[PDB]
Amino acid sequence: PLMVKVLDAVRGSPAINVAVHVFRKAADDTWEPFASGKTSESGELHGLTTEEEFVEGIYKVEIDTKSYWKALGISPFHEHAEVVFTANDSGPRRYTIAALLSPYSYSTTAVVTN
Amino acid sequence: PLMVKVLDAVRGSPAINVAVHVFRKAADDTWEPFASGKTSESGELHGLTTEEEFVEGIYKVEIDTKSYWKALGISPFHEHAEVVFTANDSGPRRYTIAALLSPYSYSTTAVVTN
Amino acid sequence: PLMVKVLDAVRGSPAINVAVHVFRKAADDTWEPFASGKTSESGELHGLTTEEEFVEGIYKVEIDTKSYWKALGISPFHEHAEVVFTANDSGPRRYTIAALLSPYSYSTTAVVTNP
Amino acid sequence: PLMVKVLDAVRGSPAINVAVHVFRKAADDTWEPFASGKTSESGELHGLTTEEEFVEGIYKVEIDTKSYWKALGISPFHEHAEVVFTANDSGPRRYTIAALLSPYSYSTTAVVTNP
Ligand SMILES: Cc1cc(/C=C/c2ccccc2)cc(C)c1O
Ligand SMILES: Cc1cc(/C=C/c2ccccc2)cc(C)c1O
Prior knowledge:
4 copies of one chain form a homotetramer. Helices cover 6% and strands 54% of the residues of chain A. Chain A is mostly beta strands. Chain A has a single domain (1-114), classed as Immunoglobulin-like (Sandwich), CATH 2.60.40. At the A-D interface, strand 7 and strand 9 of A face strand 7 and strand 9 of D. The PDB classes it as hormone, transport protein.
């Protein structure tokens, strides 16, 4: 029910081998590790979770943008990109979190479908 | 070799049934019709052209954003969104033109791969 | 009543010396030249027009992004960024067209105010 | 040396009365409150800090987008927009953090200048 897609606005390409960490907000308001992986050759990270595990709650998707730019020999602005959202059962069932990266900027959108 | 993808930043969804027109710049500097279609349920328009037909040149992708917003009962700012670019044979072979739409803003990116 | 602001997402800076051409749709449906200029050291272009001259119409703001990236020695994707809009159709407004540039992507937004 | 600017992509207007909280990473790796405020009628928030107080560090600018869209009666996707960056590590700079908001999307950029 959760996919992450990362694109590179400098090169016009998928952002490949980017580390992505997902956290779930715990009852004590700390962030607990939930899922992680590296984006593929297509800039996508599939298979993070299952419908059973992905219960309603607040989630954070952290994208390791700084390492990505450093590997390309570029000095970037941000430490990482964060996307924080609530998963809601009455909304559509599948969430795609997309991020478009530049050295000093990023944009993100959610595509939520059934 | 050309795909167009359109997303809605207000609803968090693909932008469905959006008209898209592609033009090729002629030798007299006018824009000639090249390809057109309506985005699908996934917000994508596939099958616009073939490798044989998609020669080097300057192309314009016009997305009929105004009709899209009007159909949702929303008054938008732009008449349409335009994306104008050169197709180059020495670059990668497949072009995805992506647009993210809001009533008073849009963003676009190109993902060019082999 | 018309201002254009351009930022560079690679440098984290204003996009300076960007050429901007504005056109207005004529009665015969062609694009007539309306005004032009270049962004300053602040990435802003002021003074394109006056409230008298900026009548109702369909306007196109063409931002010459390829010339900007090539002047910097960089090969970008787009030829330019075009913003096309109806202006002043419920009376005079003030328009700021802002653009954020990367080599293979741009974002644009409008801020419309009623003086 | 720190300014935050927020625009609304639905209205084509400044995003007014948006709460912004800034944090700074402490020695113990926790986020310490640093400053806070609300955007004005222009969508800008000035006066968060001083050049003396804005020392080298890792800073987080949290823009309370959900409170903004809910204050407007709208149900948005994100809880907030977070911008996290190292500041002043090659000496004092001036930072503008700009954000463009939609219910299911946002864009942010930084303009970094050397006074
Ligand atoms: C312009 C833009 C494109 C994208 C890319 C969306 C996308 C999604 C699936 C396939 C290709 C592109 C993402 C964001 C956050 C953007 O601002
Ligand atoms: C198109 C756009 C404009 C803005 C606004 C930029 C800005 C900054 C200072 C003054 C005016 C506009 C911000 C972002 C993230 C954007 O994608």
